[PDB]
Amino acid sequence: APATCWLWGD
Amino acid sequence: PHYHSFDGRKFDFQGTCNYVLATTGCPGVSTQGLTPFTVTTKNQNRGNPAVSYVRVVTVAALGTNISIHKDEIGKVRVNGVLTALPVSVADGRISVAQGASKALLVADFGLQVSYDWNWRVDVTLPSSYHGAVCGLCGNMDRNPNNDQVFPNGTLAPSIPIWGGSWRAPGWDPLCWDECRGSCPTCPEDRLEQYEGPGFCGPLASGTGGPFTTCHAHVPPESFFKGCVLDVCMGGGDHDILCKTLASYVAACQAAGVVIEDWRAQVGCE
Ligand SMILES: *[C@@H]1O[C@H](CO)[C@@H](O)[C@H](O)[C@H]1NC(C)=O
Ligand SMILES: *[C@@H]1O[C@H](CO)[C@@H](O)[C@H](O)[C@H]1NC(C)=O
Ligand SMILES: [Ca+2]
Protein backbone atom coordinates (compact mmCIF):
# COMPACT_ATOMS: atom_id res chain seq x y z
CA ALA A 1 0.00 0.00 0.00
CA PRO A 2 1.06 3.62 -0.60
CA ALA A 3 2.40 5.62 2.35
CA THR A 4 2.42 9.36 3.09
CA CYS A 5 4.93 11.76 4.66
CA TRP A 6 3.44 15.13 5.61
CA LEU A 7 4.16 18.26 7.61
CA TRP A 8 2.49 21.51 8.67
CA GLY A 9 3.24 24.51 10.89
CA ASP A 10 4.77 25.97 12.89
CA PRO B 1 7.20 22.22 11.26
CA HIS B 2 5.39 19.23 12.71
CA TYR B 3 6.40 16.22 10.62
CA HIS B 4 4.99 12.74 10.17
CA SER B 5 7.42 10.36 8.47
CA PHE B 6 6.46 7.74 5.87
CA ASP B 7 6.68 5.12 8.64
CA GLY B 8 4.56 7.22 11.01
CA ARG B 9 7.14 8.83 13.29
CA LYS B 10 5.88 12.16 14.57
CA PHE B 11 8.60 14.72 15.26
CA ASP B 12 9.20 18.50 15.40
CA PHE B 13 12.09 20.24 13.64
CA GLN B 14 12.48 23.99 13.28
CA GLY B 15 15.46 24.27 10.95
CA THR B 16 15.30 27.21 8.54
CA CYS B 17 17.58 25.86 5.79
CA ASN B 18 16.57 24.04 2.59
CA TYR B 19 16.15 20.33 3.40
CA VAL B 20 15.91 17.03 1.51
CA LEU B 21 12.41 15.92 2.45
CA ALA B 22 12.41 12.74 0.35
CA THR B 23 14.83 11.46 -2.23
CA THR B 24 16.05 8.34 -3.95
CA GLY B 25 19.61 9.72 -3.66
CA CYS B 26 20.46 7.37 -0.79
CA PRO B 27 24.05 6.11 -0.31
CA GLY B 28 24.22 2.32 -0.17
CA VAL B 29 20.74 1.59 -1.58
CA SER B 30 19.83 -0.21 -4.81
CA THR B 31 17.31 1.39 -7.16
CA GLN B 32 15.89 -1.61 -9.09
CA GLY B 33 14.46 0.43 -11.97
CA LEU B 34 12.71 2.96 -9.68
CA THR B 35 12.45 6.45 -11.15
CA PRO B 36 14.69 8.82 -9.17
CA PHE B 37 13.32 12.01 -7.59
CA THR B 38 14.09 14.60 -4.94
CA VAL B 39 11.60 16.68 -2.93
CA THR B 40 13.15 19.60 -1.04
CA THR B 41 11.52 22.09 1.35
CA LYS B 42 12.91 25.52 2.23
CA ASN B 43 11.74 26.58 5.71
CA GLN B 44 11.28 30.05 7.19
CA ASN B 45 11.44 31.05 10.81
CA ARG B 46 9.21 33.39 12.77
CA GLY B 47 8.70 34.41 16.38
CA ASN B 48 10.71 33.71 19.54
CA PRO B 49 10.58 30.90 20.66
CA ALA B 50 11.86 30.26 17.11
CA VAL B 51 9.71 27.94 15.03
CA SER B 52 9.78 27.39 11.29
CA TYR B 53 7.27 26.68 8.52
CA VAL B 54 7.78 25.58 4.92
CA ARG B 55 7.93 28.38 2.36
CA VAL B 56 9.09 26.56 -0.83
CA VAL B 57 8.57 22.97 -2.01
CA THR B 58 10.69 21.77 -4.93
CA VAL B 59 10.19 18.55 -6.90
CA ALA B 60 13.07 17.40 -9.11
CA ALA B 61 12.19 14.48 -11.37
CA LEU B 62 12.59 13.54 -15.04
CA GLY B 63 15.00 16.40 -15.72
CA THR B 64 12.44 18.99 -14.54
CA ASN B 65 12.24 21.30 -11.52
CA ILE B 66 8.81 22.24 -10.17
CA SER B 67 8.83 24.55 -7.19
CA ILE B 68 5.77 25.83 -5.35
CA HIS B 69 6.10 29.00 -3.25
CA LYS B 70 4.12 30.24 -0.26
CA ASP B 71 1.23 32.65 -1.07
CA GLU B 72 1.66 32.22 -4.88
CA ILE B 73 -1.83 30.78 -5.21
CA GLY B 74 -2.58 29.11 -8.54
CA LYS B 75 1.04 29.21 -9.71
CA VAL B 76 4.14 27.02 -9.79
CA ARG B 77 7.60 27.50 -11.29
CA VAL B 78 8.66 25.10 -14.03
CA ASN B 79 12.44 25.37 -14.18
CA GLY B 80 12.24 28.75 -12.44
CA VAL B 81 9.54 30.07 -14.84
CA LEU B 82 6.27 31.16 -13.20
CA THR B 83 3.43 29.14 -14.69
CA ALA B 84 -0.33 29.01 -14.40
CA LEU B 85 -2.15 25.81 -13.48
CA PRO B 86 -3.00 23.25 -14.71
CA VAL B 87 0.24 22.29 -16.42
CA SER B 88 1.77 19.18 -17.92
CA VAL B 89 5.57 18.86 -17.91
CA ALA B 90 8.30 16.31 -18.60
CA ASP B 91 6.71 15.04 -21.83
CA GLY B 92 3.27 14.70 -20.25
CA ARG B 93 4.70 12.41 -17.55
CA ILE B 94 4.15 14.96 -14.73
CA SER B 95 1.03 17.04 -14.12
CA VAL B 96 0.14 19.78 -11.64
CA ALA B 97 -3.42 20.97 -11.11
CA GLN B 98 -5.25 23.10 -8.57
CA GLY B 99 -7.71 21.24 -6.38
CA ALA B 100 -9.43 22.06 -3.08
CA SER B 101 -7.16 25.10 -2.64
CA LYS B 102 -3.85 23.22 -3.05
CA ALA B 103 -1.30 22.49 -5.76
CA LEU B 104 -1.36 18.75 -6.55
CA LEU B 105 1.64 17.33 -8.40
CA VAL B 106 1.32 13.76 -9.73
CA ALA B 107 3.81 11.83 -11.85
CA ASP B 108 3.43 8.79 -14.06
CA PHE B 109 5.79 6.74 -11.88
CA GLY B 110 3.58 7.44 -8.84
CA LEU B 111 5.14 10.35 -6.89
CA GLN B 112 2.42 12.56 -5.38
CA VAL B 113 3.33 15.93 -3.86
CA SER B 114 0.90 18.58 -2.64
CA TYR B 115 1.37 22.02 -1.10
CA ASP B 116 -1.41 24.46 -0.24
CA TRP B 117 0.69 27.58 -0.82
CA ASN B 118 0.60 28.05 2.95
CA TRP B 119 2.39 25.49 5.11
CA ARG B 120 0.88 22.01 4.59
CA VAL B 121 2.97 19.61 2.48
CA ASP B 122 2.16 15.95 1.73
CA VAL B 123 4.36 13.43 -0.14
CA THR B 124 2.87 10.10 -1.22
CA LEU B 125 4.84 7.25 -2.77
CA PRO B 126 3.73 3.98 -4.35
CA SER B 127 4.41 0.79 -2.39
CA SER B 128 7.39 -0.06 -4.66
CA TYR B 129 9.60 2.54 -2.97
CA HIS B 130 9.63 0.65 0.36
CA GLY B 131 13.08 1.02 1.84
CA ALA B 132 14.29 2.85 -1.27
CA VAL B 133 14.09 6.51 -0.14
CA CYS B 134 15.68 8.72 2.51
CA GLY B 135 15.73 12.25 3.97
CA LEU B 136 13.64 13.94 6.63
CA CYS B 137 10.79 11.52 5.83
CA GLY B 138 12.82 8.37 6.56
CA ASN B 139 13.07 5.22 4.46
CA MET B 140 9.44 3.95 4.34
CA ASP B 141 10.18 0.42 5.60
CA ARG B 142 7.22 0.20 8.01
CA ASN B 143 9.68 0.79 10.88
CA PRO B 144 9.26 4.26 12.45
CA ASN B 145 12.25 3.85 14.75
CA ASN B 146 15.17 3.90 12.30
CA ASP B 147 14.14 7.11 10.50
CA GLN B 148 16.46 9.60 12.28
CA VAL B 149 19.63 8.58 10.52
CA PHE B 150 22.49 10.28 8.63
CA PRO B 151 22.79 9.85 4.85
CA ASN B 152 25.49 7.22 5.49
CA GLY B 153 23.07 5.09 7.50
CA THR B 154 24.19 5.57 11.10
CA LEU B 155 22.10 6.94 13.96
CA ALA B 156 22.27 10.70 14.59
CA PRO B 157 23.01 12.30 17.98
CA SER B 158 20.29 14.98 17.90
CA ILE B 159 17.36 16.02 15.75
CA PRO B 160 19.07 19.32 14.71
CA ILE B 161 22.31 17.58 13.72
CA TRP B 162 20.30 14.96 11.83
CA GLY B 163 18.43 17.70 9.96
CA GLY B 164 21.71 19.43 9.17
CA SER B 165 23.09 16.31 7.50
CA TRP B 166 20.05 16.48 5.20
CA ARG B 167 20.45 20.08 4.05
CA ALA B 168 20.22 20.40 0.29
CA PRO B 169 23.19 21.96 -1.57
CA GLY B 170 23.24 25.75 -1.84
CA TRP B 171 24.63 28.74 0.04
CA ASP B 172 22.29 29.80 2.86
CA PRO B 173 24.29 31.95 5.27
CA LEU B 174 21.45 33.00 7.54
CA CYS B 175 19.81 29.62 8.09
CA TRP B 176 20.23 27.20 10.98
CA ASP B 177 18.93 23.81 12.02
CA GLU B 178 18.25 24.92 15.61
CA CYS B 179 18.11 28.24 17.45
CA ARG B 180 19.97 28.07 20.77
CA GLY B 181 17.74 30.58 22.55
CA SER B 182 19.15 33.95 21.42
CA CYS B 183 18.62 34.08 17.65
CA PRO B 184 17.74 37.08 15.45
CA THR B 185 15.09 36.96 12.73
CA CYS B 186 14.45 38.89 9.53
CA PRO B 187 11.60 38.90 6.98
CA GLU B 188 12.52 37.27 3.68
CA ASP B 189 11.31 40.29 1.69
CA ARG B 190 13.96 42.56 3.23
CA LEU B 191 16.74 39.97 2.63
CA GLU B 192 17.92 40.82 -0.88
CA GLN B 193 18.26 44.51 -0.05
CA TYR B 194 20.32 44.00 3.11
CA GLU B 195 22.52 41.37 1.44
CA GLY B 196 23.36 43.53 -1.56
CA PRO B 197 25.47 46.62 -2.10
CA GLY B 198 24.70 49.71 -0.12
CA PHE B 199 24.32 47.28 2.80
CA CYS B 200 26.15 44.03 3.73
CA GLY B 201 27.22 43.20 0.15
CA PRO B 202 30.92 44.05 0.82
CA LEU B 203 31.05 41.15 3.32
CA ALA B 204 29.99 38.57 0.71
CA SER B 205 32.78 36.86 -1.16
CA GLY B 206 32.04 37.72 -4.80
CA THR B 207 30.53 41.21 -4.63
CA GLY B 208 33.93 42.79 -5.41
CA GLY B 209 34.05 45.92 -3.20
CA PRO B 210 36.55 47.48 -0.77
CA PHE B 211 36.95 44.36 1.40
CA THR B 212 37.83 41.69 -1.19
CA THR B 213 41.54 41.73 -0.29
CA CYS B 214 40.70 40.55 3.24
CA HIS B 215 38.13 37.87 2.31
CA ALA B 216 40.87 35.26 1.86
CA HIS B 217 42.43 36.03 5.26
CA VAL B 218 39.38 36.57 7.47
CA PRO B 219 36.54 34.42 6.03
CA PRO B 220 33.66 36.91 5.91
CA GLU B 221 30.52 34.73 6.28
CA SER B 222 30.07 35.08 10.04
CA PHE B 223 30.43 38.85 9.62
CA PHE B 224 28.04 38.85 6.66
CA LYS B 225 25.42 36.86 8.61
CA GLY B 226 25.80 39.24 11.54
CA CYS B 227 25.59 42.26 9.25
CA VAL B 228 22.32 41.26 7.58
CA LEU B 229 20.59 40.36 10.87
CA ASP B 230 21.94 43.33 12.85
CA VAL B 231 20.89 45.60 9.96
CA CYS B 232 17.56 43.90 9.26
CA MET B 233 16.70 44.06 12.96
CA GLY B 234 17.66 47.74 13.06
CA GLY B 235 15.25 48.63 10.26
CA GLY B 236 18.16 49.11 7.87
CA ASP B 237 19.74 51.69 10.18
CA HIS B 238 22.97 53.10 8.75
CA ASP B 239 24.92 53.21 12.02
CA ILE B 240 24.29 49.54 12.80
CA LEU B 241 25.51 48.76 9.26
CA CYS B 242 28.63 50.89 9.63
CA LYS B 243 29.52 49.38 13.02
CA THR B 244 29.22 45.85 11.67
CA LEU B 245 31.41 46.80 8.69
CA ALA B 246 33.99 48.46 10.93
CA SER B 247 34.22 45.27 13.00
CA TYR B 248 35.24 43.34 9.89
CA VAL B 249 37.87 46.02 9.20
CA ALA B 250 39.14 45.57 12.77
CA ALA B 251 39.42 41.80 12.26
CA CYS B 252 41.15 42.42 8.91
CA GLN B 253 43.70 44.82 10.42
CA ALA B 254 44.53 42.27 13.14
CA ALA B 255 45.17 39.82 10.28
CA GLY B 256 47.59 42.32 8.74
CA VAL B 257 45.25 43.44 5.94
CA VAL B 258 45.02 47.22 5.97
CA ILE B 259 41.86 48.76 4.53
CA GLU B 260 42.27 52.53 4.20
CA ASP B 261 39.57 54.88 2.91
CA TRP B 262 36.91 52.15 3.19
CA ARG B 263 34.30 54.47 4.75
CA ALA B 264 34.31 56.60 1.59
CA GLN B 265 33.76 53.54 -0.64
CA VAL B 266 30.71 52.34 1.35
CA GLY B 267 29.36 55.70 2.48
CA CYS B 268 30.23 55.21 6.16
CA GLU B 269 32.12 58.51 6.52
C1 LIG C 1 17.06 21.74 -11.73
O2 LIG C 1 17.75 22.32 -10.59
C3 LIG C 1 19.09 21.84 -10.41
C4 LIG C 1 19.62 22.45 -9.14
O5 LIG C 1 19.57 23.87 -9.17
C6 LIG C 1 19.93 22.17 -11.65
O7 LIG C 1 21.24 21.64 -11.49
C8 LIG C 1 19.28 21.58 -12.89
O9 LIG C 1 20.00 21.94 -14.07
C10 LIG C 1 17.83 22.06 -13.02
N11 LIG C 1 17.20 21.45 -14.17
C12 LIG C 1 16.59 22.17 -15.13
C13 LIG C 1 16.00 21.39 -16.26
O14 LIG C 1 16.53 23.39 -15.07
C1 LIG D 1 28.33 9.08 9.10
O2 LIG D 1 28.52 10.51 9.13
C3 LIG D 1 28.65 11.05 10.45
C4 LIG D 1 28.77 12.55 10.30
O5 LIG D 1 27.85 13.06 9.34
C6 LIG D 1 29.85 10.43 11.17
O7 LIG D 1 29.91 10.92 12.50
C8 LIG D 1 29.73 8.91 11.17
O9 LIG D 1 30.89 8.31 11.72
C10 LIG D 1 29.53 8.39 9.74
N11 LIG D 1 29.38 6.95 9.74
C12 LIG D 1 30.16 6.15 9.00
C13 LIG D 1 29.88 4.68 9.10
O14 LIG D 1 31.06 6.60 8.28
CA1 LIG E 1 11.94 3.34 8.73
- Establish if B8 belongs to a structural domain: yes
Q: In what side-by-side order are the strands of the sheet with B81-84?
A: B18-23, B37-46, B51-61, B64-69, B75-78, B81-84
Q: Same structural domain for residues B26 and B156?
A: yes
- Establish if B12 belongs to a structural domain: yes
Q: Same structural domain for residues B154 and B225?
A: no
The reply to whether ligand 2 has any atom less than 6 angstroms from the CB of B165 is yes
- Strands B87-89 and B94-99, by their bridges, are antiparallel
- Establish if B172 belongs to a structural domain: no
The answer to whether the CB atoms of B53 and A10 lie below 8 A apart is yes
Output the 3-class SS for chain B. Answer: CEEECCCCCEEECCCCCEEEEEECCCCCCCCCCCCCEEEEEEEEEECCCCEEEEEEEEEEECCEEEEEECCCCCEEEECCEEEECCEEECCCCEEEEEECCEEEEEECCCCEEEECCCCCEEEEECHHHCCCCECCCCCCCCCHHHCCECCCCCECCCHHHHHHHCECCCCCCCCCCCCCCCCCCCCHHHHHHHHCCCCCHHHCCCCCCCCHHHHCCCCCHHHHHHHHHHHHHCCCCHHHHHHHHHHHHHHHHHCCCCCCCHHHHHCCC
Which amino acid, residue B184? P
Q: Which ligand is nearest to the CA of B38?
A: 1
Q: Same structural domain for residues B136 and B223?
A: no
Method used for this model?
X-ray
Q: Same structural domain for residues B150 and B235?
A: no
- Establish if B232 belongs to a structural domain: yes
Q: Is B57 on the interface with A (CB under 8 A)?
A: no
- Establish if B71 belongs to a structural domain: yes
Boundary-marking domain end, from B132, B165, B198: B165
Q: Same structural domain for residues B225 and B156?
A: no
Q: Same structural domain for residues B32 and B125?
A: yes
- Establish if B205 belongs to a structural domain: yes
The answer to whether the CB atoms of B3 and A4 lie below 8 A apart is no
Q: Is B2 on the interface with A (CB under 8 A)?
A: yes
- Establish if B146 belongs to a structural domain: yes
- What is the domain extent for residue B255? 190-266
Q: What is the resolution of this structure in A?
A: 2.2
Q: Same structural domain for residues B94 and B43?
A: yes
Q: How many domains does chain B have?
A: 2
Q: Same structural domain for residues B6 and B132?
A: yes
Q: Same structural domain for residues B99 and B21?
A: yes
Measured CA distances, B97 to B42, B43, B156 (Å): 22, 23, 38
Q: Same structural domain for residues B99 and B229?
A: no
Q: Same structural domain for residues B205 and B95?
A: no
Q: Same structural domain for residues B91 and B216?
A: no
| CA B156 from centroid of its chain's CA atoms | 20
